[PDB]
Amino acid sequence: ATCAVYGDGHYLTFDGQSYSFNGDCEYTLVQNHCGGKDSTQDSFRVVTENVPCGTTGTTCSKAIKIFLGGFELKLSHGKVEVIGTDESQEVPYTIRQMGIYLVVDTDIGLVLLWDKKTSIFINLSPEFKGRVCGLCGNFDDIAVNDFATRSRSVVGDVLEFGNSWKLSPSCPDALAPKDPCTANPFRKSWAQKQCSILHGPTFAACHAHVEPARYYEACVNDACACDSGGDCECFCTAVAAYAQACHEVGLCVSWRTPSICPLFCDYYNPEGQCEWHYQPCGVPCLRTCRNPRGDCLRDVWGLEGCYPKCPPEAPIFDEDKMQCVATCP
Amino acid sequence: ATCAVYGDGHYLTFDGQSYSFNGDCEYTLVQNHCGGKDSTQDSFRVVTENVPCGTTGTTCSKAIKIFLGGFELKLSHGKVEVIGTDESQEVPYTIRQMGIYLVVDTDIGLVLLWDKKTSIFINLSPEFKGRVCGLCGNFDDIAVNDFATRSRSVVGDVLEFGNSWKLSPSCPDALAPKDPCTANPFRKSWAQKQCSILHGPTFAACHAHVEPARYYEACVNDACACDSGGDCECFCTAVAAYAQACHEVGLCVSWRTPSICPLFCDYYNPEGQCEWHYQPCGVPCLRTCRNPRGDCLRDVWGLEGCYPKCPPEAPIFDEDKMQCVATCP
Ligand SMILES: [Ca+2]
Ligand SMILES: [Ca+2]
């Protein structure tokens, strides 16, 4: 069960329901104690802000705010700023940067992954089953009743369901999206050529497990829609969404090439030292000041990005100075 | 003296004249023995092909052909293919790949640099002064008579001068370009934000020597014009043109960042070995099978790109297997 939000209105519920929805307002992703059901647990709420990015009316996540108890966090411009600043309470968040994901972990079995541009993945602990309300749908392992609204009623309509979870009572109702490729036909050739890597031999192993037709359509639509500068991001996010979805099953796929969605993992290296590499599967467990050499805490689901390969001398990372230190004070 | 052609119709003559010209035909860059003046020297000719890349009618170099004596070379899709295949004659070209440039060198003091996408730089030996005709202008160190046409007449008109050097007698006459930013106003904000790095503190040292106003305008126009997928290339080429122009004076400037025009120099590295780094200034001289350790042959003008840093063991490169070998057979 993973609530996946990425690109322009690509939502995948916990139970495995996929749909599309676009709008310009504030939306609650996961809400606790919906309907005032205070089951002796702290109420946690995650909200997102949508702004127009393009010319055909597509949407994308710009800022994400988290309301954990009395705290309040802000996520924008690739950085985190504390806003609520709760008093006389211990900070529950354990903000950490791994790969190309700004992982934020809680103490109630809630984990968030942020690619710092548009994508976001949510995983929830099994004991919260059947007690969660929000845009992610009720966690009940049933794909037919995930369309429950705030009124605790499942409605087959998608636009109404999406608009029912808005926060600001002044933003207008959302509308149905258009066809990005019809809007930008001249981009179709390049879009298809670039997104054809999904159907290529690279994802042959994944073809047997998951069906990439939906992700292929998502890539094509995303490439078609992205008109302003930054189409490279609009394509890399679309590919990385399917990459993470495949990695969730437990299979490692290498797809990055210096011609398509390149990475620069050598910039952080100081002069004369080379200790950063690209790991498509993602390091299962590493060594840092917080996590000792013996401890691993392999709670990840498989990520990717630049990771520091510490030398045999000082093989313990620091994560504060982006360098490897023998002894952590 | 450097004939610089890059982006969309950005030509800089040997004597230091800058202008713009666009068209869809075959054009001769540098021609020898113009007018049949056979000065007991082999005739060498370099031609280029222009195809539309966009929607507003902008041009760009797709394929470049070289006619050196009886030989004929083709440059397309980031590779070189011999076409003429001259018989009973020694091959004069010494094709070599350094940095992000596919350097092709001749035996008559002519050197070509190719970024493999659109840009091309030409340098000519001083003894050919006053005996060269072509789109690069007559090599005479005078910036007022560089507009000489095939009829050996200097005309202040630019469109007529550009159209007079066409090869195919069937292609239509070239037309005046439009304003890319007026054509694509919604791209103006992103274009200016991205090209503002020219006026930033990074090029403060270069600001004292060369005036980047022309290059700033070129970057803005290039970003505005580029509409189909691949605007990242359309911006990286524009920035790298000014970078190379600055490096020609003899000053090294570092500008690549993992957020703007990134590079992937770790892909070529095999597993367990790290020997590739990014050198903004460019290696002055290296060691390979052709060029021994003692010999350097520092005939470069300052380039940039991924270069192999051989380990102390086997510190001699090979350039054939992209690896360092102790002894070259
Ligand atoms: Ca359900
Ligand atoms: Ca002249």
Author numbering:
A (entry chain B), B (entry chain A): 901 to 1229
List sentences quoted exactly from the publication behind this structure.
The two gel-forming mucins MUC5AC and MUC5B constitute the main structural components of the mucus protecting the underlying epithelia in the respiratory system. The VWD assemblies are formed by the VWD domain, C8, trypsin inhibitor like (TIL) and E domains, except the VWD’ domain that only has the TIL and E domains. We determined the cryoEM structures of the wild type D3 assembly of the human MUC5AC mucin and the structural single nucleotide polymorphisms (SNP) variants Arg996Gln and Arg1201Trp that affect intermolecular interactions. The D3 assembly forms covalent dimers that can appear in two alternative conformations, open and closed, where the closed conformation dimers interact through an arginine-rich loop in the TIL3 domain to form tetramers.
The Arg1201Trp SNP, frequent in European population, shows a double role in the conformation alteration of the VWD3 assembly. In contrast, the Arg1201Trp mutation, placed in the β1-β2 TIL3 loop, only affects the adjacent residues. The solvent exposed arginine is substituted by a tryptophan pointing toward the VWD-C8/TIL interface. The tryptophan accommodates into the VWD3 hydrophobic interfacing region in close proximity to Leu1013. The Arg1201Trp mutation implied a more discrete reduction in open conformation particles showing a ratio of 89:11 between the closed and open conformation. However, it represents a reduction of 35% respect to the WT. In the closed conformation it establishes a novel interaction between the TIL3 domain and VWD3, and the open conformation removes the possibility of a putative salt bridge between Arg1201 and Glu981. By that we can speculate that this mutation should favor the closed conformation, even though open conformation molecules were observed in cryoEM. On the other hand, the presence of the tryptophan interacting with VWD3 could affect the TIL3 flexibility important for the interaction. Nevertheless, we found that the Arg1201Trp SNP could favor tetramerization and thus net-like formation.
